[PDB]
Design an enzyme around this catalytic site. Structure first.
Site, short mmCIF file in Angstrom:
data_model
loop_
_atom_site.label_atom_id
_atom_site.label_comp_id
_atom_site.label_asym_id
_atom_site.label_seq_id
_atom_site.Cartn_x
_atom_site.Cartn_y
_atom_site.Cartn_z
N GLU A 214 -0.64 1.75 6.22
CA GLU A 214 -1.99 1.42 6.80
C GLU A 214 -1.87 1.43 8.32
O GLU A 214 -2.53 2.23 8.98
CB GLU A 214 -2.40 0.07 6.32
CG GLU A 214 -2.78 0.15 4.82
CD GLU A 214 -3.69 -0.92 4.36
OE1 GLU A 214 -3.52 -2.17 4.67
OE2 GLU A 214 -4.67 -0.53 3.63
N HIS B 249 0.83 -1.22 0.00
CA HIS B 249 0.00 0.00 0.00
C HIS B 249 0.86 1.26 0.00
O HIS B 249 1.87 1.27 0.70
CB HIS B 249 -0.92 0.04 1.26
CG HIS B 249 -1.70 -1.22 1.46
ND1 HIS B 249 -2.99 -1.34 1.03
CD2 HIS B 249 -1.32 -2.50 1.92
CE1 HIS B 249 -3.46 -2.57 1.38
NE2 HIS B 249 -2.44 -3.31 1.82
N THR C 112 -8.58 -4.90 3.17
CA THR C 112 -9.43 -4.71 1.97
C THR C 112 -10.70 -5.55 2.10
O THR C 112 -10.70 -6.63 2.68
CB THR C 112 -8.69 -5.14 0.71
OG1 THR C 112 -8.14 -6.47 0.89
CG2 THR C 112 -7.64 -4.07 0.43
N1 LIG Z 1 -4.24 -5.64 2.71
S1 LIG Z 1 -4.16 -7.16 3.56
O1 LIG Z 1 -2.71 -7.63 3.83
O2 LIG Z 1 -4.88 -7.13 4.91
C1 LIG Z 1 -4.84 -8.40 2.43
C2 LIG Z 1 -4.82 -9.73 2.89
F1 LIG Z 1 -4.34 -10.00 4.13
C3 LIG Z 1 -5.31 -10.76 2.09
F2 LIG Z 1 -5.30 -12.06 2.54
C4 LIG Z 1 -5.81 -10.45 0.84
S2 LIG Z 1 -6.45 -11.73 -0.23
C5 LIG Z 1 -8.02 -11.90 0.68
C6 LIG Z 1 -9.10 -11.28 -0.15
C7 LIG Z 1 -10.36 -12.05 -0.23
C8 LIG Z 1 -11.20 -11.74 -1.31
C9 LIG Z 1 -12.43 -12.36 -1.48
C10 LIG Z 1 -12.83 -13.33 -0.55
C11 LIG Z 1 -12.01 -13.65 0.54
C12 LIG Z 1 -10.78 -13.00 0.72
C13 LIG Z 1 -5.81 -9.14 0.36
F3 LIG Z 1 -6.32 -8.89 -0.87
C14 LIG Z 1 -5.35 -8.08 1.13
N2 LIG Z 1 -5.39 -6.78 0.52
C15 LIG Z 1 -4.55 -6.49 -0.64
C16 LIG Z 1 -4.89 -5.20 -1.31
C17 LIG Z 1 -4.13 -4.04 -1.08
C18 LIG Z 1 -4.48 -2.79 -1.65
C19 LIG Z 1 -5.60 -2.72 -2.43
C20 LIG Z 1 -6.39 -3.87 -2.65
C21 LIG Z 1 -6.04 -5.11 -2.10
ZN LIG Z 2 -2.42 -5.25 2.40
#
Ligand SMILES: NS(=O)(=O)c1c(F)c(F)c(SCCc2ccccc2)c(F)c1NCc1ccccc1
Ligand SMILES: [Zn+2]
Length: 257
Positions: free
Chosen positions: A103, A93, A196
């Site tokens: 964040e 990010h 997200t």
């Molecule tokens: N930002 S984070 O580290 O907390 C993170 C994460 F831990 C995941 F496991 C994931 S993948 C889990 C997404 C998901 C989608 C549909 C159904 C179930 C789960 C992340 F995308 C992100 N976010 C990534 C991101 C960053 C900036 C903009 C958009 C997405």
């Molecule tokens: Zn993230």
């Protein structure tokens, strides 16, 4: 539909994702004077010697560097964790300006960016099942400040022009994520969520204290990416961070001091 822009940003997410206003949302401000040193915490174990990166994807919100997680090859364990968490992807990010982008914050300080290495608990068999569990994910969060270049980031910066717009992807093998770690693994930890949508409350957050340094040229290249798809009006990919959320009934623990 959700995004970061004027009309679909973090303050709107709760309407599709009511857990946005839940009891263990992330990120949070890390108040360094109230985090409690916990001498029962373990040193973290980051074992990435066998990591197999595959592909890099612009998903319209950030870019993910994706790993093969069909075997125990890049795992995180120890620290506050029970059991073994595989690496599935990392992303960042970042801000439109160096004064913002992270964040998590540290005594309200914002870093220029924050790296998230995402891992899922092998006891649940896959990522999609893990995210439905309160201990399903472990995210290692690393702050970026602008100063000297990070040599181990350059191969990432250099492929970005090939994935400029939403939905573009590129082969990204043989990338070693050890080159993105700082020297110290001292960390803070607390129970939280994905930052997200769907904002699921499935994450043990482990946020390293020591930031890595990246050059102004490296972060400028992150800000040339686009949120939009090819042949749409350009919307630069900047400011894709969710602001700090209320800590509520949670304790942040320190591994040090
Ligand atoms: N930002 S984070 O580290 O907390 C993170 C994460 F831990 C995941 F496991 C994931 S993948 C889990 C997404 C998901 C989608 C549909 C159904 C179930 C789960 C992340 F995308 C992100 N976010 C990534 C991101 C960053 C900036 C903009 C958009 C997405
Ligand atoms: Zn993230």
């Amino acid at each position: 539909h959700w995004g970061y822009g004027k009309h679909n940003g973090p303050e709107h997410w709760h309407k599709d994702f009511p857990i946005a206003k839940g009891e263990r949302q992330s990120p949070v401000d890390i108040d360094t004077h109230t985090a409690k040193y916990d001498p029962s915490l373990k040193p973290l174990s980051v074992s990435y010697d066998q990591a197999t990166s595959l592909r890099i994807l612009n998903n319209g919100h950030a870019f993910n560097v994706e790993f093969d997680d069909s075997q125990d090859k890049a795992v995180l364990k120890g620290g506050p964790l029970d059991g073994t968490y595989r690496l599935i992807q990392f992303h960042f990010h970042w801000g439109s300006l160096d004064g913002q982008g992270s964040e998590h914050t540290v005594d309200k300080k914002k870093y220029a960016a924050e790296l998230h290495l995402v891992h899922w608990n092998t006891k649940y068999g896959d990522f999609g099942k893990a995210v439905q569990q309160p201990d399903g994910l472990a995210v290692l969060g690393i702050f970026l400040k602008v100063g000297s270049a990070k040599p181990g980031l350059q191969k990432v910066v250099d492929v970005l022009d090939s994935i400029k717009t939403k939905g573009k992807s590129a082969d990204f093998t043989n990338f070693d994520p050890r080159g993105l770690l700082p020297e110290s693994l001292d960390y803070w930890t607390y129970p939280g969520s994905l930052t997200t949508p769907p904002l699921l409350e499935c994450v043990t957050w482990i946020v390293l204290k020591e930031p890595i340094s990246v050059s102004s040229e490296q972060v400028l290249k992150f800000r040339k990416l686009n949120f939009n798809g090819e042949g749409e009006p350009e919307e630069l990919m900047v400011d894709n961070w969710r602001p700090a959320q209320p800590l509520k009934n949670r304790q942040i623990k320190a591994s040090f001091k």
